Every structure is written in C-alpha cells, then in structure tokens.
C-alpha cells in the first residue's frame, strides 16, 4: 500500500465525465474539473487538461497521468502551507498518506477548521485526534471514506484498506 493505491481505492476510476458526491464534474481518479454546473464548461476544462479534443472521454493512461499530477500537486500544496507543513513533517509515512488523502479530497482550503485536529496530530494524540476529526461535515458527508482515513491516522497502519 501507498498513497496512490489508497487513493485509487477511495476515488475509483471513471473514464467518462461524471458528478462527484458533491455533484461536481469530475473524471478519472477523482480529478475535479469544475464546480460550474455547465457540462460544456467541464468539457472545455477537460480538453485543456488533456491537450486534445476529448469529447468527454479519456483513456486509462490519460487518467493515470492526471492522477500523478494531482498527487504531486497535493504534496506540494502541503509543503507550501505553513500551517500544514510542520504537521506533515512530524508524521510517519503511513500517516503522511492519510494527510495527503485529505488534501487531495478537499484542498488546502479548510485548513482553519482543522486547526484543533492538527494540533492533536502534531502532538501524537491519536485517539483524541480521531475523535475531533469525526466532528466534521467531511465525516458526516462521506463517512465510509472518512472512517478509513481516520483509522489510518489513529493506527498508523493500513488495516482499513485491507
Ligand atoms: Cl490539469
Ligand atoms: Cl464515504
């Protein structure tokens, strides 16, 4: 297990444009295209991302490519965030993955609502963190996924994903 497989599991793989749990146009391995309600807008963003006239459909390779880039950017976002980076550096490898997962899912944004959890994580108060993290819209909206991530942070193992 690693971040890529983990996320592949949590996000799935779809080769045609679809709506995510929030209703946003997405493709591939959770690659958000746009929050706009316009399918055309989405198609435009897709073509721009891929470099060709896709007509809303992509290949597996293409999907994987967006994915790699997306992971990369998430990490890079983390390393560039002053609130995040210190936490991340303090963690072990498994838990780092849990944290990348979350940013991939929701972005850097929202980091403020997660202040308390951060602090807990930085201190290595796993069970307390786990509880605090569950007090969130995130958990209430995507509970199964959130449980997996929270478990990961709590245990430092991949058991939730096995
Ligand atoms: Cl892109
Ligand atoms: Cl879920």
From Swiss-Prot:
Pfam families the record matches: Phage_lysozyme (PF00959)
A cellular-component GO term for this protein: host cell cytoplasm
Compartments reported by the entry: Host cytoplasm
pH profile of the protein: Optimum pH is 7.3.
Outcome of mutating residue 117 to I: 500-fold decrease in enzymatic activity
Effect of residue 30 to F: Almost complete loss of enzymatic activity. The enzyme is destabilized by 1.5 kcal/mol
Main enzyme class: hydrolase
EC numbers: 3.2.1.17
Keywords for the protein's UniProt record, in alphabetical order: Antimicrobial, Bacteriolytic enzyme, Cytolysis, Glycosidase, Host cell lysis by virus, Host cytoplasm, Hydrolase, Viral release from host cell
GO molecular function: lysozyme activity
Active-site residues per Swiss-Prot or TrEMBL entry: 11 (proton donor/acceptor), 20 (proton donor/acceptor)
Catalytic function, reaction form: Hydrolysis of (1->4)-beta-linkages between N-acetylmuramic acid and N-acetyl-D-glucosamine residues in a peptidoglycan and between N-acetyl-D-glucosamine residues in chitodextrins
UniProt cross-references to Gene3D superfamilies, sorted A to Z: 1.10.530.40
GO BP, one annotated term: viral release from host cell by cytolysis
Superkingdom of source: Viruses
Effect after changing residue 20 to A/N/S/T: Complete loss of enzymatic activity
Protein purpose: Endolysin with lysozyme activity that degrades host peptidoglycans and participates with the holin and spanin proteins in the sequential events which lead to the programmed host cell lysis releasing the mature viral particles. Once the holin has permeabilized the host cell membrane, the endolysin can reach the periplasm and break down the peptidoglycan layer.
Family membership noted in the UniProt record: Belongs to the glycosyl hydrolase 24 family.
Stated name of the protein: Endolysin
Organism: Enterobacteria phage T4 (Bacteriophage T4)
Gene name of this polypeptide: E
